[PDB]
Symmetry: T
């Protein structure tokens, strides 16, 4: 009950941390992408980081609204995330693949947050993450199509 609530809050802090580190990674890809798909991917990556920033603010405000305490420092993001903004990507295909890998991991982990939220009778927290899955699975299809 109190444990159910704490499990939900902790899971939101992990996802908040993932989305902040993804916003960071997307800057790295925006800045270092090269080759003849430069214009397309430089722009796409900025669109994606704008969406990541929105998501950061949406998760943190939902956590606050349920009585929790969002993590809010880069050291905390690094300690609580299940992903990293690091990596050794150089080519356009490696960058696009890296994003497919992070968005697939976020989709699976968001499904686990829905289960926790539902177990705590928190339909609004569940609904937030259902909407996220929709958006990230769309981008996995587009990014996977780029690579096909």
């Amino acid at each position: 009950a109190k444990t159910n609530q704490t499990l939900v809050e902790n899971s939101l802090n992990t996802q908040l941390s993932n989305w902040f580190l993804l916003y960071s990674k997307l800057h790295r890809f925006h800045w270092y992408v090269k080759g003849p798909h430069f214009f397309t991917l430089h722009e796409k990556f900025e669109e994606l980081y704008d969406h990541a920033a929105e998501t950061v603010d949406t998760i943190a405000e939902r956590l606050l609204a349920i009585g929790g305490q969002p993590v809010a420092t880069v050291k905390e993001y690094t300690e609580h995330a299940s992903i990293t903004d690091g990596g050794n990507e150089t080519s356009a295909s490696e960058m696009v693949q890296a994003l497919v890998n992070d968005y697939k991991q976020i989709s699976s982990e968001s499904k686990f947050v829905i289960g926790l939220a539902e177990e705590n009778q928190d339909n609004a927290t569940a609904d937030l993450f259902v909407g996220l899955i929709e958006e990230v699975e769309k981008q996995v299809w587009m990014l996977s199509s780029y690579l096909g």
Copy 2:
């Protein structure tokens, strides 16, 4: 009484709550005073604009499911679980009245989802899920103001 009628009746109570809230927010918009006047006068208008949208959305959902929305001030008064009455005078008193009404609206909206779900009405539950998200955000903001 019926699974259907229980859903319709619960939508009429919430329709009534949101209209009475629109009313109370006008009273606060008009009588708020002190050095947070500008901020709160404006915030209360933004909130009543949201309340008016919510009134139309709930009534239109009720119609879509075959019900009959209440649609006079006498009926809103008789069907609501909150009131537009009160003797709030200070900015803090007004903000705290809103926290109380939004908290009530959130708990009852969670009960609506349960009724709707039991009547296999996922679309009605979803409207209330969305309202819970917006109201609990406002509860956080207004409680922060008082903190």
Copy 3:
């Protein structure tokens, strides 16, 4: 003098109450109108209630600006208005007729407020209600034309 002022304030509270109850009635008509003029009248009624809401805020703020105390609860609106949001309208023509009846009553009563305001040397309060008469008499002509 003080009586002149109190008569003006009381008259504004009656009109504020009328316009709030009209905003309510217009919702009822928006929701329950039927027949082949549904799209036209559903939309028209929303336009009209948007205007009623504006008018509510304009009268209440003028009352405040002259040192008065607007009524601000539905119980007060019901006790101070000269009209009602109630009624037994079912057809599109009955709904449109009901509005012609309320807008004509508001126009006559607003002319009486101009006389009171002028007697108290309150030109700005008079000007508010002159502008209202213009708008409501336009709508009476359009709504009466629908019914002709």
Copy 4:
């Protein structure tokens, strides 16, 4: 479970493309004194139908399916038709009511299938749809009232 979901999306995709078609027929052939209102309303509805076509196809693709994508396949996979012999404004509006009512029952069945397959995002898409279609069923039924 997964194949049943995919197949159900292709039926609904097909229904929405055939409704887009039927709405053009009514937009073009409506007549009588409610011409202006209904010619415009039918265009609004087909714009919504087109958006719904793209959203369902793109969800199907994101879950690893293959959207049907020819008029022959739509005809074959749909549970409605774009045919009929409606002539008056009321016949046209009543035909829309019937199709939207059918789509809404079928969409509730899709939600159950998706939920049983633990696919909450696919289910959410059909929930939203039901909201919009049942609004239109109320509005169109009210016109006939």
Copy 5:
């Protein structure tokens, strides 16, 4: 060939100004349960008539002619009238159908004169006008159907 074209433009400029006038009369006097639709439609149509007036006059100027520009001249040069005793909604709409059809056939003669004078640009102006009026004729005729 050139003075024929110029005189033919003056007659059409006159027609469009008189139509602008008639469309105000219908906007103001239309009644009955299609009031909102027709009051608004008649405004949209007069806005189009005023744009057309300015485009004809300015093409006449551009070819070296002298557009008529007083109501006495418009009455004197037009082939339609702004007069009439229309009262019902149907009478007003039927009156517009009549005028627009006369405007189309006469604009086809302007095209032929223009083409005979190797004035493609004037012809093109009127081709576009015919496209617009015949659409309005279909719409208004559909209202009456």
Copy 6:
């Protein structure tokens, strides 16, 4: 009292339609190095005139009157004319000054009639008008200065 008000609105309605006409003549025929400025200013003024035409007619209707609505009636009920033989930019601008000056005196007389008939809303419409016309009289007189 009421009939005198109605008749006075029909005169002013007529004046404004004939000014709309005269402004098109000046828009089309202005020449010399102030062409661009004045061709554009005359269009702005006729857009305002058209709006004033619709506002006066709709007020007349709201008070239970019957707006005149043909160019023959405008000619007959107006206190100005759309005729004249202005040729230079200054002649055109001076003719506008004269008409706007006349309209403004006549509008003050309308306000007295309306006030005597206890019609404050009709009176308000002409007050607003006077504000706008006297602005234009200052601007046009300054051009001539």
Copy 7:
């Protein structure tokens, strides 16, 4: 002295008041401090934008009626019934200065209507009627802030 000249002269005083008010509002915009800084810094800009519009409207009406608007800072100083000077330091002092000047402007604008009406100039009276409405609204808002 004349019915006409009395109207023209009263418009020059009000033109001058509104320009000096535009000036004072800049001083407040620039020097306001304390925790209502953001709200008041912004409000004072909105108010000076309105004052600038009002200056142009009054001058253009004066021109339209055949008068000559004053149009230098020396003349504004000499014709105004208010000043842009003052030693206001606190937010409350600045807001109260504005309430005082707006109240004065409203009472004198009512006197203008009377002069204009006596010269059968309804259009000039109407401009001032509209100004009274806007200023008295602001007086309510600013007084509420101090309440």
Copy 8:
């Protein structure tokens, strides 16, 4: 002459609806490193195809004809197909080049029939369509070059 024009418009209306369909198939199935560019381009092109469908149908109506308006009729009256086995990006783009070129030459025949019936306005519609499709042909051919 008139029934030939009408039948020729039905065939083109059919072609544009089938192209709208094919463009959805390519939007959904395109893959490889030009995905973002082509997915978006194919949407822009289908938006244009839908506008074209409505403009043809409404011109057919305006001349007194009866537009086809079911997918069975479009299949029955069209000269292209929405079928095909395109998989690669190049195959899809080449397929669009083929269809647009067929649409251009056939639209040139519509122009000649229209002109023979003194229907300049219908001809003009198709002249504008040829301008747009041949630009797209150049662009798409350039992609393949």
Copy 9:
């Protein structure tokens, strides 16, 4: 027939680029009390010239031709020049009247060649250009009148 059309488009593309250049010279050097009006007008006109350059070139591409695309080629293929010794406002405006009139008559020859090659779409491009330039000729000539 086809190589004649292509060469004729190159000459017009060249003319529009050189006009763009000349219009910059006039924008920069115009003086006297019509400065604000003419400085701005000359910018509006060069914006139109740049749009025209791109539309001609892209039509040439669309028909299978090779647009010229260096200033040495524009000088070599044009029938006007961007040179000249215009100093006064009147000289600059008169120079534009001269160029626009030459552009119109030459565009009428392009229309005839295009029509002889059954290229309606190219012809239509130039018909629209003539409409625009002759309006500008009237406006600029009016300035000088």
Copy 10:
């Protein structure tokens, strides 16, 4: 050093005062311009006063940001400016010439402020006035061209 700072602050107060008096002058020209260039110059003068108002606010806020105290009364503007809003202009050419004269004086004086700002190692204050010179020298060229 402290003297360097005080010289910069005083120079900004003189320019703030110039720009306020120019805003005033531009109203006078907007209201009293006459002749056949009326429409053009009435509009141009309003555009210019809108720019002067912006400049007023920009200089005053820069002065505040460097620790100074902007003058903020018309009496102070009159005492600190190097220009006046007064004058005996009647014709359109005299008005346009008067503005050329003030904008040329402002450009020269702004160059002197750049020298003072640079001597105090204040690059941002210098940059503000470089941007002003660009704009005012553009208008001197246009206004001088009107008169050529």
Copy 11:
């Protein structure tokens, strides 16, 4: 070490400072409380929007001059001269933290101009000149709030 490398390295420190500032401003946006909640919650978002624009501008300038921007949170932490850490709780504490970081950023940006100028890189200096203008404005506004 080189005139070029000194410029590149100084841009990486400032890039890092602006990203960590974007972070701190989120923490303040989320935890600010008390009666200035609405004003400050909104102000802090406007400031982080500006910080994000600044991050992209500095990184893109560094790239244009042939450098390599740092682009992970570990590197931002190691290269910055400020931190996103802190225990600020009150509105005044948060506003004062911002004044401190903006003042630091302004002084170091002046040092960058000097390095850039010594490497004949006027375009890099100009980017920093513009940042100084915006930051010192904010320092005035935030200090006024505390006054």
Copy 12:
């Protein structure tokens, strides 16, 4: 000092007009699968080039100079050319890199000249330019990477 500044602006003005020209050649002739991206990017760049042309000319005028204003003078005063025989997308992009790199070195030299003549505003204009060109050099070099 002053004459050296003026002469240097005329060289840079010329460079920017010739780059505007070269960007149209590449916009029109680019081919291969990066067609859509590069056809659009080249148009964005020529819009920027046109704005840069007007800004440099207007600065030159404000300092009392005389901008060159014919294609013959641009050819003669420029340090680059709009000629060349680029054919592939990479050749086109590499040619842009070379021109932007050259413009940027030359603009730094202009800044020194302007500073030595105590002209900080002219110097500022070239600083801003360097910022924008070096951005494009990074983006274009990255495409080639």
